[PDB]
Amino acid sequence: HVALLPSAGMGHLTPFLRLASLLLHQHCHVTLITPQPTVSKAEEDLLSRFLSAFPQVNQLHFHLPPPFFLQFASIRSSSHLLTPLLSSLTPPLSSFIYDMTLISPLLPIAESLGVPHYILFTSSATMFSFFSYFPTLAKSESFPGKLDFVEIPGVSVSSIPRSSIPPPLLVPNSLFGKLFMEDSPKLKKLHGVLVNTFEGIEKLSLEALNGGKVVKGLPPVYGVGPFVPCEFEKVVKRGETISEWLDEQPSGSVVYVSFGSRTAMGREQLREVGDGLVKSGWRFLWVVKDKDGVLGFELVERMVKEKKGLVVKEWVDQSEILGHKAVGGFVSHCGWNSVVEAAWFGVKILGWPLHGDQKINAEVVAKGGWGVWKEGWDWEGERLVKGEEIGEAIREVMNDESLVMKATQVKKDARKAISVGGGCEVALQKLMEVWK
Ligand SMILES: O=c1ccn([C@@H]2O[C@H](COP(=O)(O)OP(=O)(O)O[C@H]3O[C@H](CO)[C@@H](O)[C@H](O)[C@H]3O)[C@@H](O)[C@H]2O)c(=O)[nH]1
């Protein structure tokens, strides 16, 4: 009997539900805790689709008294209500896996339950190394003053520059600066850490974390990746216009563009993207999240006259788009869920990091030889990226055939990490043994 507790946002619900499907295939009774009311509507649609596809999982509604960063506080300010709810649950609990962003309030709840508790870090193992090494960094008070490189011993990336550090982690009086300083030292009071990654993309960082090389006192970190897309996420769209447009395209020519689940780009930066998409000469599938006269007349004309581009304002099926053979490139913000998905389908990535851990995730892909990202573009809002750079970068990636070779073997390593040897297969087997 395992209990799951995802955080707000599709970036945390998607890997948690994919973790549930893999646990259910290992014959388990999984209890999915849902902090309701949920934030986004896509979270509501994925839950009911997953709960209907697996009616055997237990849904424990975590009701909170009266916006992704809004219920952030309401969960930890009311986390003392899950103690009567989780303890009044039979079959008796055997393990607990919650989100890393909830490691601060859920640790006293998990220790007072008597079960081996874990966290599920929804990002890369290299970023988890930066999260673990962060206490050791700030202790040397020459920070952020004289900090040029963050050299964590044995991680996949060489040396994390100051440019790749999340900006709020350097300024005083910052929330994530204080969140990292209290959540990271709590990692020692855990039984382990599950990360959506495999050896084919993060071999060194996984061996550095398990070898006690980042920081001392770390529990065993498990690479239960990749979290391959499942069928409960598939929406039966009555139109299905996107998949049928990709069918009439030569395989490997469409450039999929998506910046995640929020897309906080301004109206200025959105104009140059579409301006660079048509200036690259390649066909594109641009997914935009408004949360409207942004595109230009001659830009919309060239997208229709040349007959190459699709622009959608909807929650698309990214699994089918990346899995479609017509897609040969991926312009991504390097969110780790989209990275592991692109690694599963063997689609090379043009990294465009925006905030947070996306510059580190972009270097993990670039180190593997199946991704390219320009360091000069900086974070979102630092400066305007012209469409000439966008078209030039897209042409540099789609013409680079060696990226497809490395992305193909990463797909092979991903297909081998869940079947024959399977780091995901073994680690999940090694987790069922401690959950006796
Ligand atoms: O139209 C869309 C948009 C998104 N997705 C899916 O939604 C998820 C998005 O995950 P990800 O690519 O990681 O994006 P975010 O949700 O923005 O990721 C957040 O969470 C990640 C994990 O913590 C962090 O690495 C990122 O920086 C942070 O932005 C994936 O399953 C996508 O395939 C779709 O299916 N369709």
Side-chain angles (χ1 to χ4, degrees), residues 1-68 70-145 147-236 239 241-296 298-304 306-405 407-415 417-436:
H1 190 177
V2 194
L4 301 187
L5 180 51
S7 181
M10 300 295 296
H12 302 264
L13 181 64
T14 306
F16 255 96
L17 300 186
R18 292 175 181 175
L19 177 64
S21 181
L22 293 182
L23 292 179
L24 294 170
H25 277 49
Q26 278 275 0
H27 311 282
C28 304
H29 181 270
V30 182
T31 297
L32 175 63
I33 306 178
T34 304
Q36 277 167 339
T38 64
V39 185
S40 60
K41 185 185 303 178
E43 281 167 293
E44 305 177 358
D45 299 356
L46 182 64
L47 282 176
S48 56
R49 253 145 44 200
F50 167 79
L51 289 167
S52 183
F54 301 97
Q56 63 275 23
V57 297
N58 180 26
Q59 185 187 20
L60 179 56
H61 302 157
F62 188 18
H63 292 282
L64 311 175
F68 298 93
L70 215 166
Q71 83 161 191
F72 209 149
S74 183
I75 290 182
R76 43 211 293 172
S77 182
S78 175
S79 64
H80 52 69
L81 298 188
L82 288 172
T83 26
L85 263 57
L86 280 176
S87 54
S88 303
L89 171 59
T90 46
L93 205 65
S94 56
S95 55
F96 193 17
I97 306 178
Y98 40 95
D99 197 304
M100 186 229 60
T101 61
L102 307 177
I103 196 184
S104 178
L106 271 302
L107 180 59
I109 307 297
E111 297 196 80
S112 63
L113 254 55
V115 291
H117 49 279
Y118 306 84
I119 62 169
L120 175 62
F121 188 57
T122 61
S123 184
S124 64
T126 302
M127 178 57 184
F128 185 78
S129 301
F130 187 86
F131 175 75
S132 304
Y133 192 77
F134 185 79
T136 312
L137 217 179
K139 287 160 188 172
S140 180
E141 281 285 330
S142 67
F143 161 81
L147 181 58
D148 44 328
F149 302 94
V150 180
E151 314 183 50
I152 311 177
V155 290
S156 297
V157 300
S158 313
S159 306
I160 300 180
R162 179 191 175 94
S163 311
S164 301
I165 304 175
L169 295 187
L170 302 182
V171 290
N173 223 35
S174 56
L175 288 82
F176 267 96
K178 295 196 173 188
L179 259 61
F180 271 25
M181 277 304 303
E182 289 207 47
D183 296 1
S184 177
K186 290 192 180 67
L187 293 176
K188 302 183 285 80
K189 289 179 171 58
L190 268 56
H191 286 260
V193 175
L194 292 85
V195 181
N196 176 25
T197 191
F198 52 94
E199 170 169 314
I201 52 180
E202 286 184 309
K203 182 189 66 176
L204 301 183
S205 60
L206 276 176
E207 296 175 358
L209 288 164
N210 290 318
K213 299 177 55 57
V214 179
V215 292
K216 279 305 299 168
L218 285 183
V221 184
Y222 306 95
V224 290
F227 289 164
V228 299
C230 309
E231 293 300 86
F232 64 85
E233 321 169 10
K234 207 274 189 179
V235 187
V236 275
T241 68
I242 291 182
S243 179
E244 296 185 9
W245 178 91
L246 298 165
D247 290 325
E248 48 171 274
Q249 313 299 329
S251 55
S253 184
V254 181
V255 176
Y256 178 53
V257 181
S258 179
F259 297 98
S261 304
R262 292 161 307 281
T263 314
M265 295 168 51
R267 285 167 168 168
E268 293 168 282
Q269 190 60 81
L270 281 178
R271 287 184 172 267
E272 265 66 21
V273 172
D275 183 55
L277 286 172
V278 77
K279 238 178 299 183
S280 63
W282 298 75
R283 47 211 48 161
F284 55 92
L285 208 176
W286 187 11
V287 181
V288 192
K289 303 300 193 307
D290 199 274
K291 280 190 173 183
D292 61 315
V294 180
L295 311 103
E298 202 162 4
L299 290 180
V300 171
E301 181 183 9
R302 284 187 56 173
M303 293 179 185
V304 181
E306 304 177 11
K307 216 65 170 181
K308 291 179 180 179
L310 289 193
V311 184
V312 291
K313 179 218 164 300
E314 66 194 34
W315 182 268
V316 303
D317 194 351
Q318 183 161 299
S319 62
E320 295 194 272
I321 297 180
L322 293 176
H324 202 293
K325 55 174 168 182
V327 169
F330 189 7
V331 178
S332 174
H333 71 323
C334 292
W336 192 243
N337 290 285
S338 300
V339 172
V340 177
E341 286 164 5
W344 169 251
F345 298 113
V347 182
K348 53 185 178 182
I349 291 182
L350 172 57
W352 189 341
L354 304 181
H355 316 272
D357 63 331
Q358 295 166 6
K359 281 194 180 181
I360 299 180
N361 285 9
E363 187 60 31
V364 175
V365 185
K367 225 291 179 181
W370 60 289
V372 174
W373 71 292
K374 313 297 179 181
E375 295 201 72
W377 295 9
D378 271 273
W379 312 94
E380 171 192 300
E382 290 295 325
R383 61 102 161 180
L384 187 60
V385 176
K386 302 298 138 55
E388 202 69 271
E389 327 177 54
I390 305 175
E392 184 84 332
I394 292 177
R395 290 191 303 270
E396 283 179 350
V397 172
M398 300 299 294
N399 295 327
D400 197 327
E401 202 65 26
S402 184
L403 299 176
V404 190
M405 300 174 56
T408 304
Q409 195 201 4
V410 168
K411 173 183 178 181
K412 301 176 183 180
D413 297 325
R415 286 188 290 186
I418 38 83
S419 185
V420 41
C424 166
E425 178 204 357
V426 171
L428 285 180
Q429 281 284 121
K430 300 302 165 296
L431 286 178
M432 301 300 301
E433 299 162 354
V434 64
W435 302 343
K436 53 93 182 180

